[PDB]
Ligand binder design. Structure first.
Ligand SMILES: c1cc2nc(-c3cn[nH]c3)cnc2[nH]1
Length: 337
């Protein structure tokens, strides 16, 4: 009953309004007749692909266990009463006004707004990393804003525990380790993404907008300069590593040349986040404690996870039929009864 596609969420949720297709499928706003407020509803139809099933179960478990101002929650989950009938799953969340991607398309951001947004992102990320979880897909369209500049991180379908050839909408925010298919990515890949987001807030355009795979690498090298052998210390393809090390030597481009009107403190922090070497890269607590964020930084008001997150049994080894069973169990609490 929307764009020709079924969206059965009534009778509680009425007055459907199409917002847009996303990672999982159709996203609509609806009127919650119980809470007398408009909400956002994700429709997911994952049960034919093993990876989508992973993503869905990942999203549900993470978001139901996390509790933080700067992280989207899950208000309700609608699905069929029997696992046989369950084809679609509807995830109900708070309706936000927009996301950072759209915002950066139309609006210029004051230095104080950039500073505050960055703080909220890192504050949320600090909690996520405290739960021993990597987000792995941080980007402007995954950062939601409400009417009063409150920021929430969303979409944890690609999240893993801190202990890939699938389609993604953009790779402009993926760390060099990820791009080079290394086997040992840590929490620092999220930090790299935030830096990219910081740079985009400062200029309203992406810092590394590659057209294709190898072009993505060239854009990075063109700004940061040629990587050393020590920078390329991850378990990576031997031929790909030799290729990078043989590319024309690039010098590092000064940040103030790319960002002439930016706060010098913002650029110093930006320099710490966009380091090629992951082990050189600044950590989330160190970023929060950077002078640029000093007016907001307060470790007494930055909640961490009560316990490190644990998918008690490992997930990507399970048949899609077993994952469906788990999704059914995790959503049983939201059923009438
Ligand atoms: C959960 C996802 C979501 N998305 C939007 C949104 C994104 N762009 N425009 C609205 C608003 N509220 C939301 N709640």
């Amino acid at each position: 009953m929307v764009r020709g596609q079924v969206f059965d969420v009534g009778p509680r949720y009425t007055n459907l309004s199409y917002i847009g297709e996303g990672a999982y499928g159709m996203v609509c706003s609806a009127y919650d007749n119980v809470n007398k407020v408009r909400v956002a509803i994700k429709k997911i139809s994952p049960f034919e692909h093993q990876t989508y099933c992973q993503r869905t179960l990942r999203e549900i478990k993470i978001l139901l266990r996390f509790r933080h101002e700067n992280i989207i929650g899950i208000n309700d989950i609608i699905r069929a009463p029997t696992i046989e009938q369950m084809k679609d799953v509807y995830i109900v969340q708070d309706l936000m006004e927009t996301d950072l991607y759209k915002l950066l398309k139309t609006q210029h951001l004051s230095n104080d707004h950039i500073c505050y947004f960055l703080y909220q992102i890192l504050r949320g990320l600090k909690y996520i990393h405290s739960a021993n979880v990597l987000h792995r897909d941080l980007k402007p369209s995954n950062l939601l804003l409400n009417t009063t500049c409150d920021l929430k991180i969303c979409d944890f379908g690609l999240a893993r525990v801190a202990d890939l050839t699938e389609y993604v909408a953009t790779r402009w925010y993926r760390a060099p380790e990820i791009m080079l298919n290394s086997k040992g990515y840590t929490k620092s890949i999220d930090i790299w993404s935030v830096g990219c987001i910081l740079a985009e807030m400062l200029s309203n355009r992406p810092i590394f907008p590659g057209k294709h795979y190898l072009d993505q690498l060239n854009h990075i090298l063109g700004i940061l300069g040629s990587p050393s052998q020590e920078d390329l210390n991850c378990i990576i393809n031997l031929k790909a590593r030799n290729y990078l090390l043989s590319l024309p030597h690039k010098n590092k481009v000064p940040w103030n040349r790319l960002f002439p009107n930016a706060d010098s403190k913002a650029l110093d922090l930006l320099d710490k986040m966009l380091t090629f070497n992951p082990h050189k890269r600044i950590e989330v607590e160190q970023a929060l404690a950077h002078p640029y964020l000093e007016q907001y930084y307060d470790p007494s008001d930055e909640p961490i996870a009560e316990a490190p997150f644990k998918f008690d049994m490992e997930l990507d080894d399970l048949p899609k039929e077993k994952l469906k069973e788990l999704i059914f169990e995790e959503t049983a609490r939201f059923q009438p009864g």
